[PDB]
Nucleic acid binder design. Structure first.
Ligand SMILES: Nc1ncnc2c1ncn2[C@@H]1O[C@H](COP(=O)(O)OP(=O)(O)OP(=O)(O)O)[C@@H](O)[C@H]1O
Ligand SMILES: Nc1ncnc2c1ncn2[C@@H]1O[C@H](COP(=O)(O)OP(=O)(O)OP(=O)(O)O)[C@@H](O)[C@H]1O
Ligand SMILES: Nc1ncnc2c1ncn2[C@@H]1O[C@H](COP(=O)(O)OP(=O)(O)OP(=O)(O)O)[C@@H](O)[C@H]1O
Lengths: 226, 334, 588
DNA sequence: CGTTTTATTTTTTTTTTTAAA
């Protein structure tokens, strides 16, 4: 989606990796593959084929996706310099950044009474100055591995979470969870949550109590581990 | 079932500490308004029916349901999660995440020839189990008004163009009701607060309050206790003995071969005190009782008789109602 | 042959049915005598017979049923030939009964060939769709006569040869016309309501039946089926049966006396004490809901709803009708649904069901788009199963703005056509209805019009002729009758009011009144003009929308109350009491 | 030692969803 010219629409290919290399990538990993282009002798009917149809496909080798540091980590012993080299693009307003870098930090959790405790920090933000919330959002979403982004109306309540679909040509439909569903071990960053919708606060509020996305929609009380 | 350990079965019934002792067990770490663990008193030594073997009429089921009202992020999920993490019939729910009509088994497209079947409903598979519901004044009018009957009727008339019947299912209910507002607005008796009338807001026996003590006093306690739940690195086996399983079996015996009756003793109280129950009805912006909660009282009668050893009715039990009720029912000052 | 065991069970079969069976005489020849018209072939025999004389050799019979049933069908024919002027044209139909024995859960592979008894409901059904089951043909060559059994699902037109070695794929087309074939139907049926489990649903199962059993089934009944489970030679499962056991001969409070028919209402001798002594009405106010208390007007009024209406002898230009539109409201926590639920026990087609759930397609069927059977079967439904019945419903409140499309039809049109991708016909509403709305905060605050106290749709309150509300008050001595009645509500000894009129004698006497058809040249019937006039003197004050659609009530309520006397020839007094509570209807 | 193989499209009713002064 960074190459596709002004007058173009992205398209997909198929991946068939067999044998050992299975289970070697998740959805939405930006990955680079070295393999072969190979056509596909789709034999069967003698008139729907028989064109020399050649519906090609790909063969696999690898899924590369664009302590070792310990001696150099010995070279440096400092706490504050992260703010000094994280997001240089604005001078000052360190306090917001250090507040973020805490969420980058983590490390608070316990399972007493059998029950868990939310060990994730969730900041709220009001303001319209020129802040470049868009700046820090892009910065974090790039450096924070396993990142996400949504906007003020791009994802209604079903999209950011799981949802449902309709088609009388492929079978039944599933949940196909959204960015908020997918962003575990990380952050999904909404921009202008104030302006999305009032009832939209509901399902997100459900995930306030973490890892609980209840759905009595596909005949379940499913969880999804938000 | 085990005949071996009969000793302690009788031992725990005749011990008046039932009020709190097992209730003290349930929240393992939390005192969180432990008049709510006495509200957990409501709940187990299992729940007898006045089924109607004599006349056969009317199907008077002894159902139980209460809610845990909101306006503060209190443990109105955590208990419900403690339960669902313990009871197998385990589900968690809330408004705006799912449909009101999840009793459907949808035929979006099927592996059939459009022999449209609605195989099994979801929210009703809790056969005497529980579905936890949260954030209750969240949904539209159709949602949460549609259920105005199943609560004490357990029927679901499937009167659609498809296949038809009158089915059965009955279970337990609890949620985290919320008014239109975050905080209960002061100066203002409770019937004004939730947007339900003095028939539907004043419906149950009691739908129980959850406030903050307006001072630091209560605040630091469970902090001081359970700040160090990370840092305690141990658990104290006190005289409130953490019953590993010695609790979990007696309740299973609690329903088997003695059978609570109701004779002539413990019923004249609110036979007579229905005077006191209803004559507070002369008033608007105040509230009295209505004649489904007296049913909830005769249902309250069932539990305490066998345990404490008179399966015929004793009279004190109704006090538990007043111990419960007027805690927010004669709190009707104006 | 092994199955000669069952042929000897078939010897056994003959041995008692031709011999002395019961009553000093035959049981199974009047069937035989009757079958001769089309060669009807349908005959019922008791299964207790295989206990009376076979001496519990049912287990020599009851296993090999589809195995040896054919042979039992052979026995039927061998019976008939022994005395009837006969040629072997006689076919098969055997429809066993008398099996003290009664389910879906008690089913396996293992259950083939038995005669268990099961009951279900009527839904989701299919029509006559015959089968030219037998027939003749041969191979390419010559042998053109085959009276064989081509009926097993593995049947095929081309055969190999008869006299000489012929082809093996060739076929003739042959005598499908001077021969004997069958006819049958097919449905879906769901688990009974006498049996009802937790969790599970009355799942659906599917079955066929014979000519004399065919099209003799109606809405929700309790019959005794036959347990001949059979395979699909696709597999998947099916089942089959051959015997059913779903008011000239009298109802309860009798023994045989004479009437217009055999014992249709014969027991006047005992009815009539409870027919005329007009305080019997108080039994019908008191001895019918002794476990219940409310207003005493409903408990003196519903009965004529249950009982037939007008059914007069007049025009073709327009219909006249008997029953009435009806309602009941109040607010809950007043015991306003006990009664409806009880009717399902009290009265026939007292289909207590919710209205909250139903669709506008609740009533008829909606669609089919594949060859289910014929690609257009949209004549299934929910209402017209009222076989001389009523459909009272709960939760008429949040209901949609389409149901009225049927209720508009209620007391004038009563006809049933659909604007779908199928066809249009019509049907006869046999039915009245009940109303089940409710108010917002309940109390119908007496400062605004009762129409406006709910303010629902336009014509609804034109058609519904009586509403009969019970509204709440706070005078607790009212309330202290109740619990002091429920003093005997659990205390199991005579825990209600002493009765004076059993349910079954009530239910029987309902009929005696419905075959009298009064005749009204009543001069007081001519002075209804004065009744209605002084009524409208009361209507003049308190100034609802009133007309002759309410006069219809003025007519029917009193005339059908003269029916309720089990009487022709209307009596004026019925009008005045009818006047009385109805003089409340404007003041209501 | 010879003589033959193989395709379907639009509308319903439910449960989803979505619109204007
Ligand atoms: N002190 C600063 N440091 C870095 N960038 C700045 C600074 N001041 C202004 N800018 C630039 O000005 C631009 C302001 O537009 P910007 O993207 O900030 O909108 P925004 O402030 O995010 O809008 P809103 O806050 O209403 O969502 C930013 O992209 C940012 O790069
Ligand atoms: N005395 C107490 N002991 C233990 N936990 C408490 C106490 N008081 C409050 N809490 C905590 O407060 C939290 C309240 O939020 P929870 O997620 O249940 O909110 P909620 O009940 O859904 O809120 P609302 O009903 O207002 O939407 C609980 O997780 C609980 O751990
Ligand atoms: N006159 C009476 N006779 C018998 N029972 C009464 C009478 N008055 C009050 N009651 C009792 O009061 C209770 C009222 O609550 P109830 O279960 O009737 O709600 P409901 O009327 O079914 O609500 P809805 O009709 O809206 O569904 C009844 O169970 C009933 O037994």
């Amino acid at each position: 989606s960074d190459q596709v010219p002004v007058g173009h629409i992205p398209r997909s290919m198929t991946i068939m990796c067999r044998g050992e290399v299975t289970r070697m990538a998740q959805p939405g990993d930006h990955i680079v593959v070295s393999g072969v282009f190979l056509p596909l002798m789709r034999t069967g009917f003698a008139q729907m084929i028989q064109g020399l149809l050649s519906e090609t496909f790909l063969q696999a080798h690898r899924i590369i996706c664009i302590p070792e540091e310990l001696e150099e980590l010995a070279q440096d012993d400092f706490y504050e310099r992260l703010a000094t080299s994280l997001a240089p693009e604005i001078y000052g307003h360190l306090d917001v950044k250090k507040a973020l870098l805490l969420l980058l930090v983590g490390g608070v959790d316990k399972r007493p009474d059998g029950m868990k405790i939310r060990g994730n920090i969730n900041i709220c933000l009001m303001g319209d100055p020129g802040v470049a919330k868009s700046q820090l959002l892009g910065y974090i979403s790039r450096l924070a591995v396993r990142s996400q982004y949504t906007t003020g109306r791009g994802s209604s309540g079903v999209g950011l979470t799981a949802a449902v679909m309709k088609d009388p040509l492929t079978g039944e439909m599933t949940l196909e969870g959204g960015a908020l569903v997918l962003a575990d071990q990380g952050v999904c960053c909404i921009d202008e949550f104030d302006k999305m919708a009032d009832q939209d606060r509901t399902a997100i509020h459900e995930v306030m109590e973490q890892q609980t996305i209840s759905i009595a929609k596909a005949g379940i009380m499913t969880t999804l581990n938000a | 079932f085990p005949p071996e350990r009969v000793e302690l079965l009788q031992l725990l019934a005749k011990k008046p500490d039932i009020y709190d002792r097992l209730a003290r067990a349930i929240a393992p770490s939390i005192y969180e308004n432990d008049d709510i663990k006495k509200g957990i008193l409501l709940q187990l030594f299992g729940g007898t029916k006045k089924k109607h073997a004599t006349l056969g009429r009317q199907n008077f089921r002894s159902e139980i349901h209460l809610l845990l009202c909101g306006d503060p992020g209190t443990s109105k999920s955590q208990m419900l999660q403690y339960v669902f993490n313990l009871v197998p019939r385990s589900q968690y729910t809330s408004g705006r995440g799912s449909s009101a009509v999840g009793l459907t088994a949808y035929v979006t497209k099927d592996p059939e020839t459009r022999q449209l079947v609605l195989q099994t409903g979801a929210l009703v598979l809790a056969d005497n189990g529980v579905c936890c519901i949260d954030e209750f004044d969240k949904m539209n009018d159709s949602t949460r008004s549609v259920l105005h009957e199943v609560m004490e009727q357990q029927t679901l008339s499937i009167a659609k163009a498809g296949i038809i019947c009158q089915l059965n299912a009955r279970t337990s209910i609890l949620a985290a009701a919320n008014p239109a507002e975050s905080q209960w607005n002061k100066r203002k008796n409770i019937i004004d607060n939730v947007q339900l009338p003095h028939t539907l807001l004043s419906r149950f026996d009691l739908i129980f309050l959850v406030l903050d003590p307006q001072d630091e006093i209560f605040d630091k306690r469970l902090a001081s206790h359970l700040v160090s739940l990370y840092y305690v690195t141990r658990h104290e086996e006190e005289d409130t003995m953490f019953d590993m399983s010695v609790l979990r079996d007696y309740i299973a015996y609690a329903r088997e071969h003695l059978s609570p009756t109701l004779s002539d003793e413990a019923q004249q109280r609110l036979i007579q005190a229905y005077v006191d129950m209803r004559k507070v009805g002369a008033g608007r912006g105040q509230i009295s009782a209505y004649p489904r909660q007296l049913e909830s009282l005769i249902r309250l009668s069932e539990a305490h008789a066998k345990v404490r050893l008179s399966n015929q009715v004793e009279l004190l039990d109704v006090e538990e109602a007043w111990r419960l009720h007027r805690e927010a029912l004669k709190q009707s000052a104006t | 042959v092994k199955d000669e065991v069952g042929i000897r069970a078939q010897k056994l079969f003959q041995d008692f049915l031709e011999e002395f069976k019961e009553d000093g005489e035959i049981k199974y020849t009047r069937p035989a005598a009757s079958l001769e018209s089309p060669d009807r072939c349908t005959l019922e025999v008791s299964f207790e017979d295989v206990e009376k004389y076979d001496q519990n050799l049912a287990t020599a019979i009851i296993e090999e049923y589809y195995h040896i049933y054919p042979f039992l069908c052979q026995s039927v024919s061998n019976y008939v030939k022994d005395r009837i002027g006969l040629k072997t044209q006689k076919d098969c139909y055997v429809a066993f009964t008398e099996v003290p024995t009664r389910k879906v859960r008690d089913l396996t592979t293992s259950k083939i060939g038995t005669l268990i008894r099961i009951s279900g409901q009527v839904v989701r059904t299919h029509p006559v769709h015959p089968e030219l089951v037998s027939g003749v043909f041969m191979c390419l060559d010559c042998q053109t006569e085959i009276r064989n059994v081509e009926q097993q699902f593995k049947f095929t037109n081309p055969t190999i040869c008869r006299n000489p070695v012929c082809s093996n794929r060739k076929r003739f087309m042959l005598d499908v016309e001077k021969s004997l074939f069958l006819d049958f139907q097919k449905i879906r049926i769901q688990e009974t309501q006498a049996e009802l489990p937790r969790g599970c649903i009355p799942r659906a199962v599917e079955i066929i039946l014979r000519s004399e059993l065919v099209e003799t089934v109606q809405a929700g009944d309790r019959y005794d089926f036959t347990g001949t489970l059979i395979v699909v030679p696709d597999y998947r499962m099916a089942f089959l049966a051959c015997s059913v056991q779903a008011t000239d001969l009298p109802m309860s409070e009798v023994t045989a006396e004479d009437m217009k028919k055999q014992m249709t209402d014969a027991e006047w001798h005992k009815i009539y004490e409870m027919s005329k002594d007009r305080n019997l009405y108080q039994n019908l106010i008191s001895s019918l809901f002794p476990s219940i208390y409310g207003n005493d007007e409903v408990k003196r009024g519903i009965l004529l709803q249950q009982f037939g209406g007008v059914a007069k002898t007049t025009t073709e230009k327009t219909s006249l009708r008997g029953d009435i539109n009806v309602c009941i409201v109040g607010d809950p926590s007043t015991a306003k649904s006990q009664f409806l639920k009880q009717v399902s026990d009290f009265s026939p087609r007292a289909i207590y069901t919710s209205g909250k759930a139903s669709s506008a397609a609740g009533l008829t069927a909606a669609v089919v788009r594949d060859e289910e059977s014929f690609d257009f079967v949209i004549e299934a439904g929910a209402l017209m199963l009222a076989d001389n019945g009523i459909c009272c419903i709960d939760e008429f409140d949040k209901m949609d703005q389409r149901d009225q499309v049927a209720i508009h039809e209620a007391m004038e049109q009563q006809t049933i056509s659909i604007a779908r991708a199928g066809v249009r016909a019509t049907l006869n509403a046999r039915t009245s209805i009940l109303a089940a709305a409710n108010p917002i905060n309940g109390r119908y605050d007496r400062s605004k019009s009762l129409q406006q106290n709910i303010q629902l749709s336009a014509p609804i309150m034109s058609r519904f002729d009586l509403f009969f509300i019970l509204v709440d008050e706070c005078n607790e001595v009212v309330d202290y009758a109740i619990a002091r009645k429920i003093v005997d509500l659990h205390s199991n000894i005579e825990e209600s009011v002493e009765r004076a009129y059993t349910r079954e004698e009530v239910l029987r006497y309902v009929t005696f009144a419905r075959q009298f058809k009064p005749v009204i040249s009543q001069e007081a019937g001519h002075m209804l003009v004065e009744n209605y006039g002084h009524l409208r003197q009361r209507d003049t004050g308190t100034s609802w929308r009133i007309t002759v659609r309410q006069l219809e009530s003025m007519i029917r309520l009193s005339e059908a109350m003269a029916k309720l006397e089990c009487s022709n020839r209307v009596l004026e007094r019925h009008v005045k009491e009818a006047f009385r509570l109805l003089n409340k209807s404007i003041i209501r």
